[PDB]
Amino acid sequence: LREVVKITVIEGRITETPKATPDPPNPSGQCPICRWNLKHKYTYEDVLLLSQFIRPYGGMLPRRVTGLCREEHRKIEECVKMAHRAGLLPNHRPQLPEGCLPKDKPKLNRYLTRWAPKSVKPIYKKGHRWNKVGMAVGSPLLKDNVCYSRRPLKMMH
Amino acid sequence: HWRVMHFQRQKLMAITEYIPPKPAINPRCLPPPPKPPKEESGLVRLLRQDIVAVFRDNRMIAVCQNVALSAEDKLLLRHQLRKHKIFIKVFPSQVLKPFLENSKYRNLLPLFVGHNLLLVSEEPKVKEMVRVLKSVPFLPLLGGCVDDTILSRQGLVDYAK
Amino acid sequence: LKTLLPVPTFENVSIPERSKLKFVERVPLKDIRGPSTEATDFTEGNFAILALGGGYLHWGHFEMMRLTINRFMDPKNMFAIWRVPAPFKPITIDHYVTPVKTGCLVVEMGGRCEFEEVKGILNQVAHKLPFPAKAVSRKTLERMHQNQRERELNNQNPWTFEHIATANMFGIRKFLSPYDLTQKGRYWGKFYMPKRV
Amino acid sequence: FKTKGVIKKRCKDCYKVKRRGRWFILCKTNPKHKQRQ
Amino acid sequence: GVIRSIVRAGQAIPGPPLGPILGQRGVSINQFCKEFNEKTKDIKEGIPLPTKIFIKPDRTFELKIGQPTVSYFLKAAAGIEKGARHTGKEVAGLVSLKHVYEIACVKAKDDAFAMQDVPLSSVVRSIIGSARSLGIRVVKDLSAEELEAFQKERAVFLAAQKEADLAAQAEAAKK
Amino acid sequence: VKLVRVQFCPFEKNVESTRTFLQTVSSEKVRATNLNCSVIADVRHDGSEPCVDVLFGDGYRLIMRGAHLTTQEMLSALASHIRD
Amino acid sequence: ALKDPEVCTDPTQLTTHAMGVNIYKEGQDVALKADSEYPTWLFQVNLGPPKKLEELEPESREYWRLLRKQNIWRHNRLSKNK
RNA sequence: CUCUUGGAUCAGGACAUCCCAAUGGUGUAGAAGCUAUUAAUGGUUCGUUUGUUCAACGAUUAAAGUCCUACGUGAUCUG
RNA sequence: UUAACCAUUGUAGGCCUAAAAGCAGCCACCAAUAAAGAAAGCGUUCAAGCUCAACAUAAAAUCAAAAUUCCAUAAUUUA
Ligand code: FES
Ligand SMILES: [Mg+2]
Ligand SMILES: [Mg+2]
Ligand SMILES: [Mg+2]
Ligand SMILES: [Zn+2]
């Protein structure tokens, strides 16, 4: 971990970083997720795994540093958004530059939010019996996850 | 407009749809099969011979980083070196590494990082080589070997005298 | 180390004397239903347009194809041929049409060129046709047939349309047409189903 | 801001963005090229 | 700033093509053509001569000039009248191999920088392309009597060429 | 930018960004772009980490060590400082 | 506009001297030295068309140099239509 | 070869907007204009037939919008 | 199949085209150099000028799930 310090004269000092726990349960796995046998068994609720790929201000890290394959990178990125929108990462809020303050509005509780709350239109004309317009819940990218229910999960509510 | 199908016929189509089989393990996450050995095209072998000849024939090799001089200003340096019968050599970095790994010179690899150019001749006109370097001040010299002796820029200047 | 490799050569190609497309005269229902029996394979060139639906081509369509191809093609290095009959079926007579079936090559191009060069123009011409069509080549056309064979062999569904229809399981033939036994559920009206196995 | 069925880049400088639920092609050099879906 | 032109020494004043643009940069336009003309007096003239005039913020005239174009130089060597429009089957000058060597003994010395063009192949192949680019076929060797036989054919061929142009020109005038 | 000073030691295997940064600084278009700068290159043989020094006539001096700073940060700081 | 027409009339002079060589009005037209007085490689230049890719050896620069040009030719062919 | 609409009164509603309102581009100098996006808020005139196959004319207006509602509406009236 | 960096010359190739110079054509299409098409585009009255491909240096890796006033309530995992 390298921090740039300005004393104008500026310099950057490298510091030690904690290392991955030894003995991966499944060596020979190319991506870190595969190495630990977590391919289809994580969801937005799993902050402990997700936080490890998050910058101090909530951004995603680039693939090259993380080493994730394309498929897992997209999944983790999507799950992070839902974790932010669900208020599960309170200490990774955006930085306020000089005098900006949080809007101070009431917070509506959410979970499994696919889209950005700002830009979704209301459903003014809902449909009839089998012509109903559906309200999406969850993300399509996580379709293949392990399911403990008799029938596949209901994405459209 | 597609004519609607009797509900009984619709039920038949739903049950007879194609189903693909799925593998147990995805191929990408599995370890990769060994790649077939690459075949050396007739560029490295011909290039390989050229680098061997220039290193063996030329006693002195001076390595300098490429400074990307203009073509109009590049010509005069070649002409000045041509007047001194000194030649400029450049080769891809990839093909340069294997020889420096197994050759008379093996400690020059740290110098051989990034864009680099080689000054080769058959006579030790080092003073002219340094003199032609003084024409361009910004261009630095990383050193190299003269008369089969490895030395840096500071030693070459004193060697010229 | 940018790896150069030998370039493909067209030393085997020969350009016909009459490169350009000739003019089609204005003047000389199961026809468009079902699979094509004619002009289903590459004859002279390596590129062509492949229909995926049953439709009628009137004279206006022919000129649109002729002018577009003739304007762009270079006589020195390119040639084009007509792969379909001229309008012959009278419609009340107001105009004549040429029936087209799924799997019919409409126009075929060749010469000292690669598929990538002609993809854009052929696709543009195909979009304007009255039925859905896509530009294809010898390699691409063969791959589709090879893919179809693979799908049948590896299909994991124990029940298929053909077995049930022929054996009249459920008395299903009460609700079916004679053609269903032949087409085996891959054709419905004038429409071709690309994923039905 | 012509709204068109298919949005296509028209010059080298054209770039694409996803704002407020729709796809945009925006070119600073030529404001003529601005489009919405 | 390097500016390259092929203006001929015989005519020293193109004018609007050069003077204004150079004047826009800022130059002594009247001096430039006169300076070109006095150079024309010193050396041969009437032939397209490449130039490498340098224009700088200092506004210093530095003309660089030398031996003329290869094509015209070869035209005298091979007795070539000039280029022909077709250039596909057009044949004007056929010259000996030895003659090719001797003409280029000092011509290649006109290089702006002392290019080490030791192989004359580089020049002959360029001239082969140049001649073919012109209305010229360059054969290995031509006999003088063969030239006369072709010249009779060329005169008849040229006369027919003029008649074809006249018929087209007359038709265009009517249109 | 009135003056720009770059120093590095080749044979020691250490930061390379500086050498590439020197190449970018020692670029004909760049040297024309910041014409006011005087380009100077001095190779050294001691065991000293590369040091980049930018000197201004106004007296502001910007010293930059590639020891752990990447070439991108070198230019980024340089651009902002030139603005002031 | 006064492009010089065909010049000279003597085949022997054309093969033993060359009037057009002179580039100085003061300078005289040069005359040709003996054949033996020129190097052999000068007379051994390739008077035919350039060797094709088939003829050239795959391990020679000329073979690959033409291959590089052909690849550029192919790129332009593909780039033309876009 | 042929053969239900007007008006008065009172209006309910759609947006595919005529005016009023917020915006993007221009072959947008200003002033006029041409084109596109968003929005249904209230409004949207008075007289007249020589010729004109479901037309026209005079004077005005910020504007004199396009349509649906068994001619919207005759147990409210009328040609 | 790509994202990083770049560009010297025989000569402005002939051709009624003033000139049409890689680019109106029109046939040829060769040259040097490690590496550069008598040029894949723009753009110039023609020229200039901007790009592409080349120079070294890098990295990634096909189709599909409108007009009265919205109209059950809700819901992603227990074998
Ligand atoms: S998780 Fe191993 S490569 Fe995808
Ligand atoms: Mg109302
Ligand atoms: Mg609207
Ligand atoms: Mg009533
Ligand atoms: Zn644009």
Numbering used by the authors:
A (entry chain r): 35 to 41, 47 to 196
B (entry chain I): 36 to 196
C (entry chain N): 30 to 57, 69 to 132, 147 to 251
D (entry chain 4): 65 to 101
E (entry chain J): 18 to 192
F (entry chain k): 13 to 96
G (entry chain l): 52 to 133
Manuscript text:
S-adenosylmethionine (SAM) is the principal methyl donor in cells and is essential for mitochondrial gene expression, influencing RNA modifications, translation, and ribosome biogenesis. Structural analysis by cryo-electron microscopy demonstrated that SAM-dependent methylation is required for peptidyl transferase centre formation during mitoribosome assembly. Our cryo-EM analysis of the mtLSU from SAM-depleted mitochondria reveals ten distinct assembly intermediates demonstrating how methylation can orchestrate mitoribosome maturation. During translation, peptide bond formation occurs in the PTC, predominantly formed by 16S rRNA during the late stages of mtLSU assembly and involves the folding and methylation of the A and P loops.
States B-D exhibit a mature CP but still an immature PTC, which remains bound by NSUN4-MTERF4 heterodimer along with an array of state-specific factors, including GTPases, GTPBP7 (states B-D), GTPBP10 (states B1,2) and the methyl transferase MRM2 (state D). The states B-D, with an overall resolution ranging from 2.8 to 3.62 Å, allowed the identification of bound factors and conformational changes in rRNA and protein elements at the maturing PTC. Finally, states D1/D2 represented the most mature states identified and characterised by the recruitment of MRM2, as GTPBP7 adopted a less ordered flipped-out conformation. GTPBP7 was flipped-out and largely disordered while the PTC loops between H74-H89 and H89-H90 were only partly ordered. According to the canonical assembly pathway, state D is followed by the recruitment of GTPBP5, promoting a significant remodelling of the PTC loops and the release of MRM2 from the A-loop post-methylation. The lack of GTPBP5 binding in our model can be attributed to (i) an absence of A-loop methylations at U2481 and G2482 (U3039 and G3040; human mitochondrial genome numbering); (ii) a clash between the unreleased MRM2 (due to the unmethylated A-loop) and incoming GTPBP5; and (iii) an increased disorder of the PTC loops. Thus, in the absence of mitoSAM, multiple causes result in an unstable interface, preventing the binding of the Obg domain loops of GTPBP5. The short segment of PTC loops that is ordered is likely scaffolded by methyltransferases MRM2 and NSUN4 Overall, our results suggest that the P-loop and the proximal PTC loop are distorted without methylation, inhibiting PTC formation. In addition, we show that the 2′-O-methylations of 16S rRNA are crucial for proper folding of the PTC and further maturation of the mtLSU.
